[PDB]
Amino acid sequence: GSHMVKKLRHLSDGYWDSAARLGVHGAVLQAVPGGRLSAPDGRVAVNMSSYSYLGLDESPRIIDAAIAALRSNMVLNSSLGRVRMTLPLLEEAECALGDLFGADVATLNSCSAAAWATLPVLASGLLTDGVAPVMVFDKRAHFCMASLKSLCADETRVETIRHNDVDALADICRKNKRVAYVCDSVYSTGGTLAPLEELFALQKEFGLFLYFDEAHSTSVIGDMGRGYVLDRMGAINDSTMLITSLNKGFGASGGAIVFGPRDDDRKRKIIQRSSGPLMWSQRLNTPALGAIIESAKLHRSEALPELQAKLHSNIALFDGLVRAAGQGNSVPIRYLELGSEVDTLEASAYLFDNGFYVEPDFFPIVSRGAAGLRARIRSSMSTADIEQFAHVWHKLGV
Amino acid sequence: GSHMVKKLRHLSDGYWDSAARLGVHGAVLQAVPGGRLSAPDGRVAVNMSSYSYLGLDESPRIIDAAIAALRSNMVLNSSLGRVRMTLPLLEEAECALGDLFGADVATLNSCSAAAWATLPVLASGLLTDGVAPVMVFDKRAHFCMASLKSLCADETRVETIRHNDVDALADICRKNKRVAYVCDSVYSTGGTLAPLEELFALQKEFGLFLYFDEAHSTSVIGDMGRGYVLDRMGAINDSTMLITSLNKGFGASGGAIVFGPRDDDRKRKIIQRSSGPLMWSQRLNTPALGAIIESAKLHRSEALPELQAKLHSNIALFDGLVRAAGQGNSVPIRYLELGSEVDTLEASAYLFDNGFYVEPDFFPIVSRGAAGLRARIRSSMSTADIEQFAHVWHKLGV
Numbered sequence A, B: 001g002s003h004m005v006k007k008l009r010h011l012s013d014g015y016w017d018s019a020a021r022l023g024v025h026g027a028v029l030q031a032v033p034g035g036r037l038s039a040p041d042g043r044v045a046v047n048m049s050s051y052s053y054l055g056l057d058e059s060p061r062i063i064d065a066a067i068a069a070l071r072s073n074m075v076l077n078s079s080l081g082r083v084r085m086t087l088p089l090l091e092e093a094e095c096a097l098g099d100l101f102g103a104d105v106a107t108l109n110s111c112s113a114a115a116w117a118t119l120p121v122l123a124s125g126l127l128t129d130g131v132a133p134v135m136v137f138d139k140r141a142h143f144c145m146a147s148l149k150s151l152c153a154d155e156t157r158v159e160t161i162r163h164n165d166v167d168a169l170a171d172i173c174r175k176n177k178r179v180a181y182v183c184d185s186v187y188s189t190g191g192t193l194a195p196l197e198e199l200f201a202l203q204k205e206f207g208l209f210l211y212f213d214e215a216h217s218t219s220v221i222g223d224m225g226r227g228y229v230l231d232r233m234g235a236i237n238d239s240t241m242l243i244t245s246l247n248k249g250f251g252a253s254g255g256a257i258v259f260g261p262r263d264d265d266r267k268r269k270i271i272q273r274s275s276g277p278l279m280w281s282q283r284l285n286t287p288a289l290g291a292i293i294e295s296a297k298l299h300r301s302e303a304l305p306e307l308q309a310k311l312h313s314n315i316a317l318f319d320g321l322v323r324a325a326g327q328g329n330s331v332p333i334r335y336l337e338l339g340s341e342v343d344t345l346e347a348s349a350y351l352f353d354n355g356f357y358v359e360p361d362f363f364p365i366v367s368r369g370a371a372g373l374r375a376r377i378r379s380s381m382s383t384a385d386i387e388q389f390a391h392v393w394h395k396l397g398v
């Protein structure tokens, strides 16, 4: 009911229309070996924004395992609800993830479905000894969690703090009995991570329940690829829950809920018996589950340390050549902030035309005037790939 | 409007724990040809509650096409949001669905994701010319839609009418400018159907936006399996939107949105640019997409009229032997009501020891004291499987 808002919707559709007109959005492109993309005219670009940080999207062992699972089981999924029955492949997949993370792990269609199934239940208090907690959302929490604040609000009090405002979180932890912090482990489209040491300290003093989105941490950091939180925490406690994706880094499909300690079946029961995607939404298909089992084996092999070393070496190379948000960290997300959406779109079109695709984030993905290009470092990037990108990038000024 | 977590679970958990203790829930069973289930004991039972209505989860053409799609792409999926780019396999799949339904159709990883991506946007008025409509939910609309009422309540007024209370709906239409009705085309429980003629009449008179869930309507009902709504409407219009899942009946994986007319990209653009699962939640992997393309080809061929006829034949054979709720309906869902939650778990455990699994519905899945056995007729069932089951159902002495 505002003219100031329809003025924004018109400015909005113009940028979206420009991104399609410029070919940086809506392109139909074929996957090509080397983290590259092929257009119908034959021209191939290097994907600077692929979220397969370990290059496991091109792993022949994962692909063959997915094919073998479909051939042996001769079915795509199950023909009944999960609460009813499970295929043996599913239990092998979750047992493998449980061995890897060292916790009780369930599979879902997506990390989004994991949030839909967990966040409203954590807010109800059934996961916090019958005490409904104060759900504290970080401002930069991914919208698969932030869009569900209203669901959490119907159950308890929902507060949103500024990005990594640890001070404010303590005030809520002091003034309130039970509190939960809903955040991302690492923050994409930004060079920021979660304050694990401060958050852990608040957890020891006030019993703060910690809800992390490990989507851009799984496989990237830590032994066995367990991620950023489990590399600092060591072993999961009864007050820390993780959700993540398995299509990025892990090299598979779907998402997962890391409930907590593997000896406690209570959190899994409560969420499974709750009205959510874990009860009513379909399970991962036989190809995906076969991929998860193979990728889990590779995470226990000597290959994962090698893939992580090549990634962090590639990050070091990039940071030594291009100045981006997060320069110095060990996360594979590097955001090139340009402010203007016109500059961001024009830069993506220049790079894409010169052999490098970098995804453009504007007004709906990021705040207005905070536009920029989201580069993502992968282990499957060659040295020449990064060195050549920096060359093309610096030919624009900035 | 809301859909809050059930806090009192002593009665519920006793029923869940009993179901798992008696093996009717939480069992690890292998899929076997003929719509059958293998156990660690080696015991084989017929699945009487399988959602694969046309038996397409055992079609070798669909499985081969899923394997072929993965062998030729050598990646499970692309590594970017579908806004940035898509594989040609995804465009071929959504074009294939578009030809079948005769509408603009997008795919997601589940029907639940399709609901998350549409209902909040429909409640904002962006789909109805900027006028926020009154969101009118049916009481027995599936919970993947009903759980998001709080999201819709942030954008407009939400109300829930009694099941198929068309007179109460018509009253809501007279009192407001724009109204939208959210429901299922076919309801699993009760054997009821959406009152299409009253709804189409209200759509003509008031402009009632219609939002159908077709998870149990696609494939099983209508010419070319286009569903119950499209078979009566013929050609979709500007004020009708469908969501459905493609793993039950359709024989594939994931879900879909049927936006509206196929020559109109306005609805797709609005939703694709909204902050929802269609933007940020992973696309279907290449096996699922290959399955959708093949399944779409089958639905256009003379194999769908066959499978629909073998289903209606098997439905009639079942209705002549076993007296169940819905007897006489053309929907392949039947309720063997037993009232006692305890006796429902006993019947399911007895039938499953004798070779016929029927999933037990108890509280909270169904109202207390209204427990039943939910059977699903499939075209993959043999006349022997149906008559042999009717024998075991009467030897039980129900």
Ligand SMILES: Cc1ncc(COP(=O)(O)O)c(CN[C@@H](CCC(=O)O)C(=O)O)c1O
Pocket (backbone or CB within 6 Å): A051, A109, A110, A111, A112, A113, A142, A144, A184, A188, A213, A215, A216, A244, A245, A246, A247, A254, A255, B079, B080, B081, B082, B279, B280, B281, B282, B283
């Ligand atoms: C931090 C975070 N959490 C959750 C999700 C959702 O996980 P799903 O398993 O895909 O539901 C994403 C996806 N953000 C991706 C987009 C993913 C895609 O659409 O392919 C990104 O923008 O890199 C994410 O970046």
Ligand SMILES: Cc1ncc(COP(=O)(O)O)c(C=O)c1O
Pocket (backbone or CB within 6 Å): A280, A281, A282, A283, B109, B110, B111, B112, B113, B142, B144, B184, B213, B215, B216, B244, B245, B246, B254, B255
């Ligand atoms: C009527 C109905 N709608 C929606 C869904 C959602 O299914 P899915 O999220 O697995 O695609 C289902 C699942 O039970 C359903 O039966």
